[model samples]
Target: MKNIIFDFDSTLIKKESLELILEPILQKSPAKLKEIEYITNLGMQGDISFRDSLQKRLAIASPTKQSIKEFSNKYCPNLLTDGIKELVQDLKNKGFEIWIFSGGLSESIQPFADYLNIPRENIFAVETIWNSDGSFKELDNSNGACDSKLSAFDKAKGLIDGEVIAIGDGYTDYQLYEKGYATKFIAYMEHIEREKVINLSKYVARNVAELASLIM
Candidate 1:
């Protein structure tokens, strides 16, 4: 049995879903736009380490939990791809275990996972630091090291005995293939184009149904 691991934001959902969800709020500050651009590029390049990138991005963007919650409530439900839920159900029926590995906020992505009926335990993403009053905090490096983007590959280490397939659309996701962590790597580009990702992935596909069909 092959376990299907997916990247949450762009791979399974749509491109820029995280940024677009927070756009209205981030647009309030000009500085945040520049920070977002830089962080996004670093992330796409696999340049800045995931831990540093997450902390730096939070320092520059510092969005509140309430803001994140609003984005989840308003946008997450719609951000999922056209046939993802159906495809996931199909995969489940075929006995594939689904897991989400992502660098986006865990709390924000949780709702969409719930809507799709994916168990929360099966989802992995960056955790937010919040104060008692719900204000954002400078994230401790430990959390990212624990569940950051680059470390995402570590999540798959346990599946060494099983046939595993990793599907994603980011340079960071390529770490799994780059490091030879999984049996197969499928890069998705139906939404955004990260040339490096397209060039490096072992298998590149345009749609989830196509990917699911190919694997099954």
Candidate 2:
């Protein structure tokens, strides 16, 4: 199987890109930052729905086009975890098709994906709707990488009917296997580990090197 799907946020990048993007804009309100932490933690652990977590977050700090541009160009590029570059490069050399499916905003994922040399069309993330004034209005929700991941597998550039592995840190990533799509689900704990999420996976990789060894 030449196909490998990855999760964004704490999987590929050490930091949740959304939180980084929103922090600068929300720094004035320390209370809202605390809320962001709570919601993000709950959502990742499957204690609360991802949809609710996302909605509650954006409602707090909506990104303007300019703000997202700064994030994509400046912050997202520096947040990648150790060994990710080498691992992705090795996988690319081995001809594994890399696909990123995430609940992160497309604007932020694009530059980071570009840095990894992953194709733009291979990315599946939450797209945003902008107001006339260029502020983030709401989620487009047309993309399949939102709530459940079976739809994400369905919406890949082509139907990959071979052994396809998935790596992620949250329940949304494991949903690929739960719904009978992925060949295996590898719990990625490089940054943070969710107990319930890790328990669901038969395989676990604590770092990018371990992750590469597991798949490669």
Instruction: Choose the strongest candidate by TM-score.
Output: 2
Question: Which residue runs of candidate 1 sit more than 4 Å off their true CA positions?
Answer: 138-147, 150-156, 159-161
Give each model a TM-score: 0.87, 0.93
For model 2, residues 66-185, the per-residue Cα lDDT tens digits are 788888777656788887878888998987888888888888888888888888988888888889999777777676656656676687646565777889998888888887777789
**Distance from true location, Cα of 3 in model 1, Å:** 0.9
lDDT of 2 at 204: 95
What local lDDT does model 2 show for residue 191? 89
TM-score: model 1 vs. ground truth: 0.87
Clashing pairs in 1: none
| Distance from true location, Cα of 69 in model 1, Å | 1.1
Model 2: residues with Cα > 4 Å off, grouped in runs: none
